[PDB]
RNA sequence: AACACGGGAAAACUUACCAAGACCGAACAGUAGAAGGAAUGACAGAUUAAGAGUUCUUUCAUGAUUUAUUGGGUAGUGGUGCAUGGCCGUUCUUAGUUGGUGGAGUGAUUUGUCAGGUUAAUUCCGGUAACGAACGAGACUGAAACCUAUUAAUUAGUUUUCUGCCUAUAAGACAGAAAACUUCUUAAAGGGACACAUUUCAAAAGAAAAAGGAAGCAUUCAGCAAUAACAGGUCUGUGAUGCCCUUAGACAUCUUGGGCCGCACGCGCGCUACAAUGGAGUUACUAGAGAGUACCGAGAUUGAAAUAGUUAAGGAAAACUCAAAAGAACGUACAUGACAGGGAUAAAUGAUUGGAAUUAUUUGUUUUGAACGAGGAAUUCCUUGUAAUAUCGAGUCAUUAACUCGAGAUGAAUACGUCC
């Protein structure tokens, strides 16, 4: 017998019928952050590479932009993910389902690109060459530029950090909000932790032009 | 009882009854807008949630 | 640890009948589903990963367990269920 | 009927604000003008550092909420039928029946 | 770049410290023992703060959930931020950094990246063994400063009309709906200053006056912010983490009480004062920007001298709540008096929050009436709706600001300067 009376609930504020407008959008973004960081810890081997929270007014559509859909047998893994959500967030079984898409631009995604280095580093590939192969895929994938930073105990007990750059990249301004794609990953080693920060400078395909540009045509 | 006295103190007002959603810290909490996320953790996911450093 | 005798079977079927179960790392509240302290649920099924019955992914102070291949075999001898009683990649 | 739309993106509601108004020409004759309720900035201020060291610095996070209200007579059964239209993520549609 | 900093306004928890008491949060694997009982919980009396059966004389319920065992993980607000990730600060808020080819040098390296002028700025004109480029600056983003032109109109406003009421000598006021527009309001899209236009000064980038203009210092205030580095802070925010340490009489976990408030003193940030450019008694006031669920913000009716008590609408909110004092006007008051300035320290008493207010949580009534007469050497912040003055909202919050982050209310003086 336990003298415990408190009962922490298993729900989410995006299901409440009555809520303020200030609280709704805060709860809408709070749910995504917990959810996005959740299946990231699960689909890291599958390269989750993004989530979406599209809604059709009543039904909840969850979209996973995974870069490798080989694992997802008649949706057995997909079905298991739904079961966790029902127990955690208290979603009705008829009002939530999971969709998966395969991203065509594999290199352009920094979230899945940083997992390549995290995998290779744990395998024992040299950090100088592991990034070089990874950086090769990003450059020809239509990316204007990228920067990969590795910091930790790469060489010895003393901490060292190398920064690898390629292509054009604007470092300051508001335009960097509409052109950057970044991800932060850390891999446990036998001596400590290696911190991998991967960011990618995009192009005009994510519609929006750079700040300074004239591009005068001819007659 | 071996566990009847375990956690028998009532915590319903809240300094040790409220925790951060992920970090679990008891200090620096931000209960505004029902965030329930203490600092050093809200800043990590501020842009993720939807907050942007405008003026 | 020492759990209620009727509770061990009750929590086992809930996992088997669903294949997935969540819990709160806080040890001052009761489980809303099973009506028992989360200490019993956490302590009982933190070793189901040592027996390789489930996985041990924990996120935002919440621990998630998903039935494995070896989990079905272990959760049949103890639960005394028929062989054909399979979630079949659904539960 | 009364259509209330609120979202964090100004152009998301604004594009959908004229989408319902244009759609009102069919299965109906008129839709009232869009009422632009004042926005509600959500300012949260935090200390940059994770500890007490360093200079006293803060970052001013903020999120805006844009509110638009529409009115329309039509019929309750065939106001918009589906009334889903695959709305974009981050936007919310609430319909006040009668 | 330590000291109202750790968002740290600690009664319990937080909590990491102290006095006690227990307690496993020792999974899993092998043994013993065991459904013919491994063990678990307990009423009574003693012991114990304790109604922790902790233990004891004691029988009453359940039963493999695992009691004793070695490996083992394990857990730690334990150590190391001189092992690390992330974040932040700092050099450094100024204008700086570079590789591709070419030129010079055996080489470290260097030129480009400069004579002069100009800019806030390696910003440009110009010069040129340099040419062509990348980042930074600029550009960019948010607010403000304008739209009697456009779009819309409730939860914003104005106007008209119908009804009732009241004072006027003739204007209209107020209360209840009714329905029309968009000057104000709100929020979208474009428009709108680029120093172009004049004079002067410097074949040039450019500088100053004045005019016009809502707006002429990059228009103002902010955000983002280069290369390289610190062995700067954080492993006491993290289920980010290596190594080391404790690891069933525990540095793991829980409960009771205390401490972080302790005072011979020194230092930093602030609030209130030393008054008549004022305090006290009345009267009308005018804002801006925040927050609110099932019990949160709480309207209205009452008793009370106040703090507060009892019943209780509407409100997930341009809807309802949520409200301004400094200053002003009123009086044959105060009258230069440590006085009626100052409200410290104390003494009675009344309530709210809390399971608990003692070392007073906060606050009401009366009484008590302390230093302080404008402040040494030193030393901080500040150039325009800025300083200063007084106040309002929010974070912390069961209750608690002299704090911080914001907001409006009045509105100085002194510079348009030089490296002391």
What is the DSSP track for A41-72? HHTTTTT---EE--B-SSSEEEEE--S--S--
Rounded distance between C-alpha atoms, residue A189 and residue A121, angstroms: 9
Is some CB atom of chain A closer than 8 A to the CB atom of D67?
yes
Rounded to whole angstroms, the Cα distance separating C86 from D11 reads 50
The candidate with the shortest Cα–Cα distance to A145, out of A128, A161, A126, A166, is: A166
DSSP H helices, A90-202, are 110-123, 127-140
Tokens of A43: 């689909």
Q: Do B33 and A3 touch (CB under 8 A)?
A: no
Q: Is D58 helix (H, G, I), strand (E, B) or coil?
A: strand
**Complete DSSP assignment for C4-64:** -HHHHHHHHHHHHHHSEEEEES-SSSB-TTTSSBHHHHHHHHSSTTTTTSB--EEETTEEE
Subunits close to B (at least 3 CB pairs below 8 A): A, C, D
SS3 assignment, position A166? strand
| Matching residue, tokens 């604004």 | D14
- Classify residue A66 by burial, with Cβ atoms within 10 Å: 0-12, 13-18, 19+: buried
Task: Kindly report the nearest CA distance between residue A172 and chain D, in angstroms.
Answer: 17
Q: Is B19 on the interface with C (CB under 8 A)?
A: yes
The H or E element that residue A146 is part of is strand A145-152
Q: Per-residue b/e over B2-38, b at no fewer than 16 CB within 10 Å?
A: ebeeebeeeeeeeeeeebbbbbeeeebbbeebbbbbb
Q: Which of B4, B19, B48 to mutate to test the interface with C (most CBs of C within 10 A)?
A: B19
State yes or no: chains C and B have 3 or more CB pairs below 8 A.
yes
Alpha helices per DSSP H over chain A: 21-42, 76-89, 110-123, 127-140
* E strand or H helix at D17: helix D10-23
Report the SS3 class of residue D57: coil
Q: Do C20 and A84 touch (CB under 8 A)?
A: yes
Instruction: Please tell me what DSSP assigns to residue A113.
Output: H
Range 35-54, chain C: CB under 7 Å to any strand E atom:
39, 43, 46-47, 50-51
| Beta carbons of A26 and D42 less than 8 Å apart | yes
CA angle A94, A28, D2 (to 5 degrees): 80
Task: Mark residues 39-68 of chain D whose C-beta is closer than 7 A to nucleic acid strand E.
Answer: 39-60, 66-67
Q: Which two tokens stand for residue D65?
A: 């909420």
**Among the partner residues A3, A29, A177, nearest to B50 by beta-carbon distance:** A29
Q: Is B8 helix (H, G, I), strand (E, B) or coil?
A: coil
Q: Which of C20, C30, C38, C67 to mutate to test the interface with A (most CBs of A within 10 A)?
A: C20
Alpha-carbon distances, residue A70 vs A47, A50, A75, A156, C3 (angstroms): 11, 17, 11, 38, 41
**Experimental approach taken:** cryo-EM
Q: Are the C-beta atoms of residues A150 and A194 closer than 8 Å to each other?
A: yes
**Model resolution, angstroms:** 3.1
Q: How far apart are CA C15 and CA C35, in angstroms?
A: 15
Nearest CA in chain C to A88: C22
Q: Are A159 and A153 in contact (CB under 8 A)?
A: yes
Q: Output the CA–CA distances (angstroms, integers) from residue A79 to A98, A135, D37, D43, in the order listed.
A: 8, 35, 42, 39
d(Cα D12, Cα A53) in Å, to the nearest integer?
A: 15
* Alpha-carbon gap: A68 to the closest alpha carbon of chain C (Å): 20
Q: What are the residues whose beta carbons fall under 8 Å from the beta carbon of D65, sequence distance 6 or more?
A: A21, A22, A25, D6, D7, D8, D39, D40, D41, D42
């Amino acid at each position: 017998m336990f003298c415990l009376t408190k009962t922490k609930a298993l729900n989410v504020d995006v299901l409440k019928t009555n809520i303020s407008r200030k609280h709704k959008f805060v709860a809408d973004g709070v749910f995504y952050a917990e959810l996005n960081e959740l299946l990231q810890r699960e689909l890291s081997a599958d390269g989750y590479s993004g989530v979406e929270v599209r809604k059709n007014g009543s039904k909840f559509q969850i979209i996973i932009r995974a870069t490798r859909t080989t694992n997802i047998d008649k949706g057995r893994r997909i079905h298991e993910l739904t079961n966790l959500l029902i127990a955690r967030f208290g979603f009705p079984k008829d009002k939530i389902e999971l969709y998966v898409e395969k991203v065509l631009a594999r290199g352009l995604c920094p979230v899945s690109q940083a997992e390549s280095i995290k995998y290779k580093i744990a395998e024992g590939l040299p950090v100088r060459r592991a990034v070089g192969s990874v950086m090769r895929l990003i450059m020809d994938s239509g990316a204007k530029g990228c920067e990969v930073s590795i910091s930790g105990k790469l060489r010895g007990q003393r901490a060292q950090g190398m920064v690898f750059k390629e292509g054009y990249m604007i470092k300051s301004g508001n335009a960097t909000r509409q052109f950057y794609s970044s991800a932060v990953r850390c891999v446990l080693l036998r001596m400590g932790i290696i911190g991998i920060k991967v960011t990618i400078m995009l192009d005009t395909d994510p519609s929006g032009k750079n700040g300074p540009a004239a591009r005068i045509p001819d007659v | 009882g071996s566990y009847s006295i375990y956690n028998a103190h009532p915590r319903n007002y809240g300094n040790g009854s409220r925790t951060c959603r992920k970090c679990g810290a008891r200090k620096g909490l931000i209960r505004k807008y029902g965030l329930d996320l203490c600092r050093r953790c809200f800043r990590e996911k501020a842009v993720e949630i939807g907050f942007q450093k405008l003026d | 640890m020492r759990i209620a005798t009727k509770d061990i079977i009750a929590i086992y079927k809930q996992l088997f009948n669903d294949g997935c179960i969540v819990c709160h790392k806080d040890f001052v509240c009761l489980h809303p589903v099973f009506g028992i302290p989360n200490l019993q649920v956490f302590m009982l099924m933190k070793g189901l990963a040592t027996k390789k019955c489930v996985k041990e992914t924990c996120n935002w102070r919440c621990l998630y367990w998903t039935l494995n291949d070896e989990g079905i075999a272990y959760l049949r001898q103890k639960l005394a269920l028929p062989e054909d009683a399979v979630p079949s990649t659904l539960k | 009927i009364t259509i209330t739309i609120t979202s964090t993106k100004v152009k998301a509601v604004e594009s959908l604000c004229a989408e319902v108004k244009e759609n009102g020409k069919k299965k109906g004759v008129q839709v009232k003008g869009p009422v632009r309720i004042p926005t509600k900035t959500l300012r949260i201020t935090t200390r940059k550092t994770p500890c007490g060291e360093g200079s006293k610095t803060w970052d001013h996070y903020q999120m805006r909420i844009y509110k638009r209200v529409l009115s329309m007579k039509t019929t309750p059964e065939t106001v918009k039928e589906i009334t889903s239209l695959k709305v974009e993520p981050g936007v919310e549609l609430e319909v006040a029946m009668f």
